[PDB]
Amino acid sequence: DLPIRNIPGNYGLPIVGPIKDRWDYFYDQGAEEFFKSRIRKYNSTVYRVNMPPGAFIAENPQVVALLDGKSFPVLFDVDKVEKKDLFTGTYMPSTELTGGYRILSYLDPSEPKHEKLKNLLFFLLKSSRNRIFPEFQATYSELFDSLEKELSLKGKADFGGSSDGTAFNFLARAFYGTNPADTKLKADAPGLITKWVLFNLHPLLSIGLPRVIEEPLIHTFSLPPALVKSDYQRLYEFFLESAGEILVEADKLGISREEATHNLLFATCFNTWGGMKILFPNMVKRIGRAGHQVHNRLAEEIRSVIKSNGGELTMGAIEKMELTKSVVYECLRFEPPVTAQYGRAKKDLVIESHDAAFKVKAGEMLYGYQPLATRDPKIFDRADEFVPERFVGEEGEKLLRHVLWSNGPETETPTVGNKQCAGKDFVVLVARLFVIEIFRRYDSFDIEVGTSPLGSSVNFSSLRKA
Numbered sequence: 001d002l003p004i005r006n007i008p009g010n011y012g013l014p015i016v017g018p019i020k021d022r023w024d025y026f027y028d029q030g031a032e033e034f035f036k037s038r039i040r041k042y043n044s045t046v047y048r049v050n051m052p053p054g055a056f057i058a059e060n061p062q063v064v065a066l067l068d069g070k071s072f073p074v075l076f077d078v079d080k081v082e083k084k085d086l087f088t089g090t091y092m093p094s095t096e097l098t099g100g101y102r103i104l105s106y107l108d109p110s111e112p113k114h115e116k117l118k119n120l121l122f123f124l125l126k127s128s129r130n131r132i133f134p135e136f137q138a139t140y141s142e143l144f145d146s147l148e149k150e151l152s153l154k155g156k157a158d159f160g161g162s163s164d165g166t167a168f169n170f171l172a173r174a175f176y177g178t179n180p181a182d183t184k185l186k187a188d189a190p191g192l193i194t195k196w197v198l199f200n201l202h203p204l205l206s207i208g209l210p211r212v213i214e215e216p217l218i219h220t221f222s223l224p225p226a227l228v229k230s231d232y233q234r235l236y237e238f239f240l241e242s243a244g245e246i247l248v249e250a251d252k253l254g255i256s257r258e259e260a261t262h263n264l265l266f267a268t269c270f271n272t273w274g275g276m277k278i279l280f281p282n283m284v285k286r287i288g289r290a291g292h293q294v295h296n297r298l299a300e301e302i303r304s305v306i307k308s309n310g311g312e313l314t315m316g317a318i319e320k321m322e323l324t325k326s327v328v329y330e331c332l333r334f335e336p337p338v339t340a341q342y343g344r345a346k347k348d349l350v351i352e353s354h355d356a357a358f359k360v361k362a363g364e365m366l367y368g369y370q371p372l373a374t375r376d377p378k379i380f381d382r383a384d385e386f387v388p389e390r391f392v393g394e395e396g397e398k399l400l401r402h403v404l405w406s407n408g409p410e411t412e413t414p415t416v417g418n419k420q421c422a423g424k425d426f427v428v429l430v431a432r433l434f435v436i437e438i439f440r441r442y443d444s445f446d447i448e449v450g451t452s453p454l455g456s457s458v459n460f461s462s463l464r465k466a
């Protein structure tokens with residue numbers, strides 16, 4: 001059996017310990033090296049560390065970090081960890097940002113509204129099923145048209161600053177049968193959502209500014225919710241007016257129209273659009289780096305399969321696209337779009353890692369940095385390599401139990417009883433549709449890459465048409 005080890009690490013002095021750790025995290029090391037350097041110092045993938053934001057935003061920055069794929073899954077076990085008000089970590093954004101409600105993402109499964117609200121989203125997703133393919137194909141076709149246009153003008157085409165509009169338009173049309181162009185939102189939604197998301201997440205992000213500016217401006221106190229209330233109201237009225245069919249189901253589930261609307265707004269703008277804002281540019285980055293031979297192989301598979309399917313893209317056709325499925329899973333393994341999962345121990349726990357076990361007391365905040373679980377070399381071979389074909393075949397597919405992007409194993413299903421992403425199957429579907437739309441159109445592409453507060457900044461520098 002595993003030896004019991006004392007959890008190494010410490011929190012430094014009051015005030016200055018957490019500040020120095022925050023500087024390492026944001027500025028002097030960056031998140032990955034912040035965690036890896038301490039794995040090396042402590043010779044442990046489980047240790048005590050301060051997490052941002054601390055300061056006057058979070059009451060208590062002290063966590064136990066789980067940084068391997070054996071210990072990490074404790075964070076999924078709702079009998080071991082409480083998942084209340086910790087969606088964003090050791091602080092929670094003001095409910096003033098969300099209509100006065102504690103939104104689904106912050107609710108522990110022990111709360112009755114968790115079941116009701118998650119069921120509402122499951123319905124939203126199921127009811128959209130026959131709109132997803134045609135609306136994705138129409139909206140993303142327009143995006144690539146615009147990218148070709150921009151490339152012809154500038155010699156490069158900024159992906160993110162067009163793809164954010166495309167994502168919102170797609171979601172509005174697929175979920176609500178509503179084109180934002182036909183509404184008072186016009187083309188404003190991305191800007192509105194970006195500002196509102198910033199008011200929620202600024203304690204966790206760097207914008208690029210020098211630390212002397214950023215630290216007092218976004219890392220010490222919460223930005224005032226009052227400043228984004230009118231923008232939020234524009235979004236709220238769009239959802240109230242557009243989500244009629246879904247609101248009928250909300251009524252049947254016993255959810256108030258107001259609560260349902262705030263939750264639909266959040267699920268659409270924050271969970272879905274925000275998650276896509278991170279995922280899609282990251283996918284372009286990793287697939288771009290994979291090189292033209294991989295591009296050509298994806299193009300060959302995708303086009304051949306669609307031809308075999310009489311030109312009709314369907315769920316069943318996608319199941320034949322083995323390399324495509326595997327590439328999407330590898331993007332999610334290599335670069336989890338959301339790196340930070342938290343859980344508060346409900347009771348005393350014994351947490352097993354690879355070489356030792358650790359005891360934590362009820363009330364301790366557990367934290368996992370997902371990339372270190374999903375690139376754990378004791379679980380995955382070639383762990384730090386992007387391997388397009390990793391999940392192809394019976395043996396490859398077994399490894400999906402260790403892909404954790406959704407806050408649970410990829411082999412598991414989100415339920416009203418767990419805190420796994422309500423949109424798990426939707427995300428994997430639209431990520432596949434994204435790769436499919438790229439390679440039905442292009443043989444290969446080249447990219448330029450930069451940093452972004454969320455995800456990656458990506459430009460196309462070449463789009464080689466079929």
Ligand code: HEM
Nearest residue numbers: 104105121271272275276279337338407418419421422423
């Ligand atoms: C690429 C896009 C997405 C990404 C990267 C993503 C990622 C995640 C992650 C990591 C969590 C766990 C949060 C935690 O730490 O507790 C989560 C939860 C959640 N996500 Fe997703 N998500 C995406 C899309 C969606 C979609 C399409 C929906 C629509 C239903 C959705 C709804 C939710 C909800 C409601 C939760 C909380 C679940 C609960 O309370 O049981 N997300 N998501």
Ligand SMILES: CC/C=C\C[C@H](O)/C=C/C=C\CCCCCCCC(=O)O
Nearest residue numbers: 087088270271272274275337338339340
């Ligand atoms: C813009 C919101 C990003 C994703 C939405 C998704 O449904 C899950 C969110 C999960 C937790 C909320 C905090 C997101 C921080 C994302 C950037 C920092 C990190 O990757 O840890």
Ligand SMILES: CCCCCCCC
Nearest residue numbers: 202207217218223227
């Ligand atoms: C980076 C913080 C800026 C806050 C924006 C306020 C807009 C009125």
